[PDB]
Amino acid sequence: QGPVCTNLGLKPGQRLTVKGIIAPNAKSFVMNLGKDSTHLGLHFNPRFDAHGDVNLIVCNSKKMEEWGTEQRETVFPFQKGAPIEITFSINPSDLTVHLPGHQFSFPNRLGLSVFDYFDTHGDFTLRSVSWE
Amino acid sequence: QGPVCTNLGLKPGQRLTVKGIIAPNAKSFVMNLGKDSTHLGLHFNPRFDAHGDVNLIVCNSKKMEEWGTEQRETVFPFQKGAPIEITFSINPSDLTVHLPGHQFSFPNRLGLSVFDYFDTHGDFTLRSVSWE
């Protein structure tokens, strides 16, 4: 139930920037990054209120329909009804998430080299996907 | 084979901007826009040298695995190896292809209201998809 872009064709070293608006009464949204729908390096799920979590980010990886080990982040810079811009980066070392004033990290489990897949759903309205 | 984006979710009046680079030795490339992969409001195919055509654009529409009436327009503002930006709009009457220096029109055959689907392949490298 959301935007899905396959075979983006990023090159090594290129970072994926995503822009959109968080819904007025957002409960949560997710952004999935990886090689394809069944090989997600980063599952980025900010939750304002969902599954018992309040204002925290749930990050994870997904391989062949099986979730990896969850990691929560309580630094929650997201506001409802607000416009956000997030740039994702990747290297053999790990994945980086950069937001104005914050920078998160996540191990590069799947050993991906670039982001070729990106989808999103939830209380977020996508408005831009660009890379360089 | 190339980038495919589904369910972009554009609202009435929003224009889709596409950015990328035309290959240095490009023969041709295509951009398909519509509701989904089987309901293409506009099949945009610039041809430098392909299938007998030289320096011209072929446009068409598609419905259930079957192309509409092909149309060829001869004003060719593209250059090989050049970065380009194209913005597509759609209204009840026609669809608009905005290039720097030229604006093209194509009939709104399927009566679509917005662009929810976009894909591309050929001698063009996508680097950005945004709307507003």
Give the residue on A whose Cα is nearest the Cα of B130: A128
CB-based contacts of B98: which residues, under 8 Å, 6+ apart? B15, B86, B87, B88, B89
A114 CB within 8 Å of a chain B CB: no
Radius of gyration of chain B (CA): 14
Please indicate if the annotation marks A60 as binding a ligand. yes
Q: Which residues pair with B116 in a beta bridge?
A: none
The angle subtended at Cα B65 by Cα B62 and Cα B71, nearest 5°, is 30
End-to-end CA distance of chain A: 27
To one decimal, the resolution in angstroms is 2.1
Domain A1-132 has CATH 2.60.120.200: yes
User: What is the C-alpha to C-alpha distance for residues A122 and A1, in angstroms, rounded to an integer?
Assistant: 8
Report CA-CA distances (Å) from B112 to A3, B4, B57, B82: 18, 19, 22, 31
User: What is the C-alpha to C-alpha distance for residues A34 and A50, in angstroms, rounded to an integer?
Assistant: 24
Are B8 and A6 in contact (CB < 8 Å)? no
Sign of CA dihedral A19, A21, A22, A23: negative
Are B3 and A3 in contact (CB < 8 Å)? no
Q: Which residues of A touch B130 (CB under 8 A)?
A: 19, 127-130
Q: Which residues pair with B22 in a beta bridge?
A: B124
Technique used to solve these coordinates: X-ray
B23 CB within 8 Å of a chain A CB: no
Q: Count Cβ atoms within 10 A of the Cβ of residue B44 and give its class: 0-12 exposed, 13-18 middle, 19 or more buried.
A: buried
Q: Are A45 and A58 in contact (CB under 8 A)?
A: yes
CB-based contacts of A14: which residues, under 8 Å, 6+ apart? A114, A131, A132
User: What is the C-alpha to C-alpha distance for residues A58 and A44, in angstroms, rounded to an integer?
Assistant: 6
Q: Which residues pair with A47 in a beta bridge?
A: A28, A56
